[PDB]
DNA sequence: TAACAGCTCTAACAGGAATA
RNA sequence: AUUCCUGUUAGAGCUGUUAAC
DNA sequence: TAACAGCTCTAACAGGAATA
RNA sequence: AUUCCUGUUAGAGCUGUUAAC
């Protein structure tokens, strides 16, 4: 069964779904594996005979391990990773005191170094809002005791060996959730982890399993069998009318490195009638990650704490500007609200299409598709015939910034609207490199007054300089001073970007002339690049940086007209 | 490389210094071209085993002790190589020792601890006219942070009547036993050092 | 009676609260 | 007694299994040798390639 | 330390790979004596550029990565230290890059 | 083992992070670090977070 | 305290257990392929002699 | 999955030297 | 590659917005 | 410093090849 | 000296216990 479809088959019916966690899930929380517990115990045991610093050498050095196993070894102990090892060296170690036994796993699988993921806070979420009614889990610690009480923010009523006959009973009156441990807590004597422990059931509990097995369908995850007493447990609970009523998935991280037990067990359990299904999602983490995503209105109280990423922390305020100032290139347009034409297509259309709609018939207008036009609609009739225009009508973009964040072809459109309002009735002309637009000098009129103030920015030693012309070794490569213009969408407001550039009027003929533009921009330092910033402003706005709101619009004399508004003043603020 | 003809002469003259000298003389056209050839394979025939070995002084020993400072590999051949039995045993002998003399290395301890330097000495006799004199050197067998591992020994030094370091004596081979350690780590302390010794140690020594 | 390794053992284990008199 | 045994075992100059004593002694053995025979080697240390 | 002649060889048939391979297994004399040395001052002459930098390939990289294991602290060396102007550029980079390849900090 | 964006998965930056800690307690004889600062040339998706 | 883990490293220091000159490591118990020796235990802890005294060294 | 828009990055080259 | 990051020429990666399949 | 006892090791030779 | 360390023949160094100088 592929994973695609057992996740649609859960997503299908998750309201009877009881979860088998074993004790792999808990591999993740941080607490120590079975693996990390028993190498914990040689080197506990390892350095206390043969007396060695405890804290001169680690644990996970492949040298010491290797040493303390070596040493294991030679006192005739189990070889490597082998079934009663963990049971054994817990006996050896502990000389059969259960009690001290108890403390050791309490302390190591303590409930300070647990830091819930998004696995264990899925799964808690899933018991309270009432899908998932009985998680019964192999463990000990309480990763989801914790992290399911805290997502939901009420406590969880967890089961155990102490009393055993508590589930039952609250599966009979339907105390759901319930969340009963077969081994039980470590707080309490009984923990059912030696492997003398391990052979038999409690009476109980067992009986629990096969009442629930009827009632909801069952999952197990993390778990990967070499277990007797819940083999037989799952076997017997196999062995009853409609056992599991949706069906059992074992699912596992890998197929391939199953223990023959499962798939043995998934096999018999075809046998008897039941729709057993084993599949691979990967890791517990990343199936409970895409369960919570296939989730259908999820509570937001509770989802605030399943993805904690999900809501925008660091909003951190920003101060005032109270109490040198740094004068950045960014102009703030105050424009909130602007008004559009919107045509109505009788067939679809692509926004290529539309593109390639432009570079043939080239109008006087401007139009993107979300079909927004800006212009006048004759030139929309040019563009579009009354065949495949259906009606023409008015569109309010109340919110530009939110707008312009919100979808990049209305950036990009807003982008060209201000920059033909800009450029609309002034000589400089409009060129484009990439998808950047640049306000250049032209050639022809590059004597004019409203260019002498440029002429003094770029002079040297405030003498009259230059501002279009010849590179100095090109063969036909010509300069002019220009201005890389942009719109940024910074938080919730929209600014300009202006950047002194030096244009060359072939436009792929740009490197030859690096040099000079590095040339021409050796000693354009803060005071000259002030200057021509300044200069900059004054062409592209007509107004010194001084209090001013020059509004432009883009169309005047059209029935689709943007007027935009501009502050002549670049962005500044005083240090604290 | 050919031996020159004059130690065929010393041959008969017994005299193993001569015989020693005459063979680096015989290697001397190899000290120019040292990065043309990894390993010298020097061969002393069997007509030569009146030098081999006599009181106070071992052929091999000399050839080895003058070759070292000049930095380059010998693998010693004599007949006892081309006159046992066993093919296979010498071939493995012969080959690894090529190979590990070239730099290479055929084999590491597994899993073995970066953090453990094993400090052995050890000493020798020569017999002097009025006394004796007894030759204590160490070695070190440490694993550096990278993935090979060194092997290197030293003397422990003026005059020794007895194999027992002195406190001075001992602190010093210690001590530079220590710098070694470091150059190789980064500087890093010797958490635990193992010192093998022939002989038990003194109170000052410890 | 216990050995030693084992008195060390649970001291190590609990050594946060026990007491010394001397 | 576990690094004395694995230090027996990495003597290239041997094509045997393993030795009776470790690296470690044999070869300052070896130096102890060919110091005795040349006075003019104290003054500096050696690898294991030049000797073995 | 003296470079193989092959590696002359090398570079002109253009094999990256190759060359820094031989390169490395250049370094076996210095290896025989680790201990002697701290940091190994590797140059390269301009005639092996066509294997400097190539598409898929940095001779830099490879030689660091495989030099990197044996724990051999190298400080490379283009004709950039022969020529370069302000000559007392070259000993404050390659002089601060010495002392923290030999010890640290 | 091959990665097709620049963007570590959950699990990826989980075992990232649980070796980056693990080194400093190592080198801190396990003490807990108190601040962390990740900086990446690139936005973390909601999967890094 | 050879084995009390997460200590400070300037406690360390200051303590350093000192060290160990008389070496004495305990011997396990007696256990349970079990290797014959060739050694026979001796058990008369005490004989009894005889002592001449002489009137020259 | 196929285009399209923006934001940002690296991958190869080239390249000159600290307010003149 | 003692360094530095300034540009050029390209491609990807993410987001999106449509059309689907 | 001269014997004596034991423990232990190296100095020179010689010497066969791993359950027969 | 491809190696291994089993024997033989000797001597030295450490400790001790005496005799003293
Ligand atoms: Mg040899």
């Not at chain 1, 300044?534 to 619009?553: E, H, M, Y």
Request: glycine fraction near 6%; proline fraction near 4%; hydrophobic fraction near 40%.
């Amino acid at each position: 069964l592929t994973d695609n479809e057992f996740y649609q088959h859960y997503l299908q019916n998750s309201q009877h779904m009881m979860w088998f966690l074993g004790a792999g899930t808990s591999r993740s929380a941080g607490l120590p594996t079975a693996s990390d517990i028993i190498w914990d115990l040689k080197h506990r045991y390892y350095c206390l005979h043969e007396n060695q610093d405890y804290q001169k050498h680690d644990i996970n050095n492949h040298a010491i391990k290797s040493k303390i196993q070596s040493y294991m070894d030679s006192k005739g102990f189990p070889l490597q990773w082998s079934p009663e090892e963990y049971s054994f060296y817990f006996e050896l170690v502990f000389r059969d005191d259960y009690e001290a036994q108890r403390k050791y796993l309490l302390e190591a699988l303590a409930s300070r170094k647990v830091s819930l993921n998004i696995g264990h806070r899925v799964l808690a979420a899933l018991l309270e809002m009432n899908q998932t009614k009985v998680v019964f889990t192999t463990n000990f610690d309480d990763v989801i005791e914790t992290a399911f009480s805290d997502i939901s923010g009420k406590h969880l009523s967890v089961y155990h060996l102490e009393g055993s006959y508590a589930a039952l009973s609250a599966l009979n009156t339907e105390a759901f959730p319930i969340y009963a441990k077969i081994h039980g807590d470590f707080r309490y004597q009984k923990i059912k982890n030696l492997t003398p422990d391990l052979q038999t059931n409690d009476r109980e509990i067992h009986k629990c399993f096969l009442a629930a097995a009827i009632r909801f369908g069952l999952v197990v995850s993390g778990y990967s069998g070499r277990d007797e007493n819940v083999m037989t447990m799952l076997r017997a609970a196999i062995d009853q009318n409609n056992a599991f009523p949706h069906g059992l998935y074992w699912t596992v991280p890998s197929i391939s490195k199953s223990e023959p037990a499962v798939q043995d067990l998934i096999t018999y359990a075809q046998g008897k009638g039941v729709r057993a299904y084993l599949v691979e999602t990967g890791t517990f983490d990343e199936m409970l990650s895409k369960i919570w995503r296939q989730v259908k209105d999820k509570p937001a109280a509770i989802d605030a704490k399943v993805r904690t990423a999900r809501v925008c922390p660091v909003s951190i305020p920003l101060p005032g500007p109270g109490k040198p100032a740094l004068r950045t290139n960014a102009l703030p347009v105050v424009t909130q609200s602007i008004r559009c034409g919107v045509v109505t297509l009788a067939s679809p259309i692509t926004f290529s299409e539309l593109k390639e709609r432009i570079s043939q018939k080239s109008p006087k207008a401007l139009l993107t598709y979300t079909v927004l036009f800006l212009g006048g609609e004759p030139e929309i009739r040019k563009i579009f015939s009354n065949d495949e225009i259906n009606s023409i009508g008015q569109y309010y973009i109340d919110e530009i910034a939110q707008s312009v964040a919100a979808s990049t072809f209305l950036k990009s459109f807003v982008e060209e609207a201000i920059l033909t309002a800009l450029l609309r009735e002034k000589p400089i002309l409009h060129r484009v490199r990439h998808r950047t637009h640049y306000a250049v000098i032209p050639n022809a009129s590059a004597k004019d007054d409203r260019f002498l103030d440029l002429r003094k920015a770029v002079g040297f030693k405030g003498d009259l300089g230059y501002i279009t012309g010849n590179v100095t070794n090109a063969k036909e490569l010509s300069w002019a001073e220009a201005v890389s213009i942009r719109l940024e969408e910074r938080g919730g407001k929209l600014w300009i970007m202006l950047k002194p550039e030096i244009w060359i009027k072939p436009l792929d003929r740009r490197e030859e002339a690096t040099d000079f533009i590095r040339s021409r921009r050796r000693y354009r330092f803060n005071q000259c690049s002030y200057q021509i910033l300044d200069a900059w402003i004054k062409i592209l706005f007509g107004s010194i940086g001084g209090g001013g709101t020059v509004n432009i619009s883009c169309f005047p004399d059209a029935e689709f007209k943007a007027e935009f508004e501009i502050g002549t003043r670049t962005a500044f603020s005083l240090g604290v | 490389c050919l031996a020159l003809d004059e130690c065929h002469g010393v041959a008969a003259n017994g005299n193993g210094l001569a015989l020693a000298d005459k063979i680096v003389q015989s290697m001397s056209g190899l000290f120019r071209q040292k990065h043309a050839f990894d390993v010298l394979l020097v061969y002393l025939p069997a007509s030569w085993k009146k030098c081999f070995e006599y009181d106070g002084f071992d052929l091999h020993d000399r050839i080895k002790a003058k070759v070292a400072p000049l930095n380059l590999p010998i693998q010693i051949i004599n007949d006892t190589a081309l006159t046992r039995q066993c093919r296979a045993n010498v071939m493995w002998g012969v080959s690894v020792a090529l190979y590990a003399k070239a730099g290479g290395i055929p084999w590491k301890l597994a899993d073995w601890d970066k953090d453990e330097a094993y400090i052995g000495l050890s000493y020798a006799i020569k017999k002097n006219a009025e006394g004796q004199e007894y030759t204590t050197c160490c070695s070190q067998v440490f694993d550096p942070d990278g993935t090979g591992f060194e092997f290197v020994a030293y003397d422990t030094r003026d005059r020794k009547g007895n194999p027992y370091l002195s406190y001075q004596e001992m602190q010093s081979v210690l001590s530079k036993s220590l710098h070694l350690y470091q150059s190789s780590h980064n500087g890093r302390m010797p958490r635990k050092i193992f010192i093998h010794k022939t002989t038990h140690f003194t109170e000052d020594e410890i | 009676v216990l050995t030693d390794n084992e008195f060390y053992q649970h001291y190590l284990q609990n050594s946060q609260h026990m007491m010394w008199f001397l | 007694c576990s690094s004395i045994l694995a230090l027996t075992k990495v003597d290239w100059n041997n094509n045997t299994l393993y030795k009776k004593l470790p690296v470690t002694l044999v070869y300052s053995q070896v130096f102890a040798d060919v110091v005795k025979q040349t006075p003019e080697i104290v003054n500096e240390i050696y690898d294991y390639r030049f000797f073995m």
